[PDB]
Amino acid sequence: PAPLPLVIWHGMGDSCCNPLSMGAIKKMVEKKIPGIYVLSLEIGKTLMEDVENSFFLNVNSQVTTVCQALAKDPKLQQGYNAMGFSQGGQFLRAVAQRCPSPPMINLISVGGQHQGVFGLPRCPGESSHICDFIRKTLNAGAYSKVVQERLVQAEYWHDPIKEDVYRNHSIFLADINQERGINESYKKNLMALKKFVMVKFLNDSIVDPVDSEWFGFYRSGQAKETIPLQETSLYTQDRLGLKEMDNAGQLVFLATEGDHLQLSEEWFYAHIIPFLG
Amino acid sequence: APLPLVIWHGMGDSCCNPLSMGAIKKMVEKKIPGIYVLSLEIGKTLMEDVENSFFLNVNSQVTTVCQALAKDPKLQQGYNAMGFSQGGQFLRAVAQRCPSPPMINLISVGGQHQGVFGLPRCPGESSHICDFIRKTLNAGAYSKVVQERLVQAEYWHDPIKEDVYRNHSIFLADINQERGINESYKKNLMALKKFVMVKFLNDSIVDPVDSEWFGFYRSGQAKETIPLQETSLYTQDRLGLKEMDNAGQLVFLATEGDHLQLSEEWFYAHIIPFL
């Protein structure tokens, strides 16, 4: 009886294979589950292209590229566990909904933004000036054709005030969240997951609002008060099956202290490794 | 006791890639033994260096490098400078703005001294950042929010909206005296012993390629170009480029390759003698 393979999808301003980031996660997992095969997804020919593609490659293409890669890797045929960091969380959810084959078994979301974001106060890495540019571009015109198509963070930019512009113009997050209409296969495929685990960082200064990490968001028509998944219409009308999943024990809501993606060895071993054996 | 060399990389590149600026460094160190080469890094990491080549204001980059050169002891006696691609016009801006310590020879390797009016292809594995920058430039290169943050916009040069360019460009229009004549820009540039310009005859990056020899599209349209010596920049000699040309201070080299594509033999033969 072997351990399931793990597929990792990194977040923004990061690559597959930085020893200090996804490299450390891979080693950490390999030590506590021996013989495990870990695929850290790279979208690009080099590590630097991987990093700039995390800002500038259309996520719908990224998802197709990753589906093709997963279809080609023989070690994943019998199924895999998936773990996304930051924006990689909602990307791997997208993979679960769009290509359910080979089967993802446990989706683990580490500080993902499943209802998107409405602000960009800080980028991970040494990325301040690219961040400043992205922020300005988003606040100026996140929902123009030309910006939607070419800026990754625009494609899960979720304005709770101008909600109907978000529904009509988001080329990624609005689709995977059933905002424009109910894709039945998305619901079916998300419900086929054994566990959907969501990690929230209580002192997170990157993700706005932090509630997006637990599939919650700003209440419609304003941008101060947040509401949890259970009070949103995505849940109560159950467009993705999250209410059926919540009732069936399939959803796990984990919270840790610390800023974005800052997690100790103790906690990781205590709460994430159990989902990977 | 050979003069030290200061290198400024181009767009989509860093100080220290073995296949790029690292290869230049190792090559110059072998041919000129005991030479001190400073490959400029504008950022904490190599990764920030690359993305600052796109998103850190050039005026902030130039004042930073000048401070970094003034504090460097090995350069107080003087130094040679070699700029690759945009590093070309950047180091020229150091020549014009930061005369102490004294730059001796300026080598522009595919620099864009009259800027660009197009971005059809970017160096390295960077096609998607290039798409975004291209669309942004063709939409709002001269809006205040873009100018202050996007490097390529700061040497974007619209010949059809020449009036708008002179008025809004916060870098190229300054160092090319498009607003007025900063008398020390001129005086400082003319203090170089040699200002060498390398043009790539198969360049598919730089639009228009003659910008590498300080030429550009004729004002008012974007089909026909004109060389340095027919432009009003040279007519009225706002930078001292005519006096330098007549004094034999301008050296123009052409090589047959695409952008930054040159052989070791050609380099040893034509570039090393200025170092």
UniProtKB/Swiss-Prot annotation, chain A:
Report the EC number(s), separated by commas if there are several: 3.1.2.2, 3.1.2.22
The pH dependence is: Optimum pH is 7.4.
The Gene Ontology biological process annotation of the record reads: adult locomotory behavior; associative learning; brain development; endocytosis; fatty-acyl-CoA biosynthetic process; grooming behavior; lipid catabolic process; lysosomal lumen acidification
Residue pairs linked by disulfide bridges in the UniProt entry: C16-C17, C67-C99, C123-C131
Q: How is it modified after translation?
A: Glycosylated.
Entries under InterPro entries matching the protein: AB_hydrolase_fold, Palm_thioest
According to its UniProt record, which residues of this chain constitute the active site?
Answer: S86, D204, H260
Q: Where is this gene product found?
A: Lysosome; Secreted; Golgi apparatus; Endoplasmic reticulum
Q: Pfam families this protein is in?
A: Palm_thioest
Q: Name one GO molecular function term.
A: palmitoyl-(protein) hydrolase activity
Superkingdom field: Eukaryota
Effect listed in the UniProt record for changing L190Q? In CLN1; juvenile onset
- Give the residues annotated as coiled coil: none
Explain what switches its activity on or off, per the activity regulation comment.
Palmitoylation reduces PPT1 enzymatic activity.
Query: A Gene Ontology CC term for this entry?
Result: membrane raft
Answer yes or no on keyword Protease: no
Glycosylation positions in this chain: N168, N183, N203
Q: What does this protein do?
A: Has thioesterase activity against fatty acid thioesters with 14 -18 carbons, including palmitoyl-CoA, S-palmitoyl-N-acetylcysteamine, and palmitoylated proteins. In contrast to PPT2, PPT1 can hydrolyze palmitoylated proteins and palmitoylcysteine.
- Name the associated disease, please: Ceroid lipofuscinosis, neuronal, 1: A form of neuronal ceroid lipofuscinosis with variable age at onset. Infantile, late-infantile, juvenile, and adult onset have been reported. Neuronal ceroid lipofuscinoses are progressive neurodegenerative, lysosomal storage diseases characterized by intracellular accumulation of autofluorescent liposomal material, and clinically by seizures, dementia, visual loss, and/or cerebral atrophy. The lipopigment pattern seen most often in CLN1 is referred to as granular osmiophilic deposits (GROD).
Q: How is the subunit organization of this protein annotated in UniProt?
A: Interacts with CLN5. Interacts with ATP5F1A and ATP5F1B.
Family statement drawn from the similarity comment of this UniProt entry: Belongs to the palmitoyl-protein thioesterase family.
- Its protein name is Palmitoyl-protein thioesterase 1
